[PDB]
Amino acid sequence: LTPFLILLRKTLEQLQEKDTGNIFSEPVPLSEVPDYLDHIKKPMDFFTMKQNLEAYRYLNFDDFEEDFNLIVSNCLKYNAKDTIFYRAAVRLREQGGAVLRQARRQAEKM
Ligand SMILES: Cn1c(=O)c(=O)n(C)c2cc(N3CCCCC3)c(NS(=O)(=O)c3ccc4c(c3)CCCC4)cc21
DSSP: OOHHHHHHHHHHHHHHHHOTTOTTSSOOOTTTOTTHHHHOSSOOOHHHHHHHHHTTOOOSHHHHHHHHHHHHHHHHHHSOSSSHHHHHHHHHHHHHHHHHHHHHHHHHTO
């Protein structure tokens, strides 16, 4: 274990708690959304983030936070504004920003 990776684990749990519908917990289902990859270059979701974390693919906070931001921005891009998904991504961006601000202040003074 390392202190940084433990912090990322805690931070990832805190971000997922904000996704009360669990709609970002797993990859957007390509079987239901067959054109998703037409529009979205790099899909992201909380399970893939956890897999990245446990595989040591986040050694710095920026790479981790950019993947969180990708969950949000992919959703805003794909979905019309008047959808449950778009509205949920906006709320996740707002509620997650505070989580990431406090967590980044911990990794920097590490
Ligand atoms: C295309 N899409 C996104 O762009 C996106 O950001 N998310 C986060 C999505 C997330 C899901 N779920 C959400 C449930 C958990 C499994 C993954 C799906 N599955 S779904 O069968 O199309 C579906 C599912 C539920 C509802 C609708 C579509 C339409 C509105 C009514 C509710 C597509 C998503």
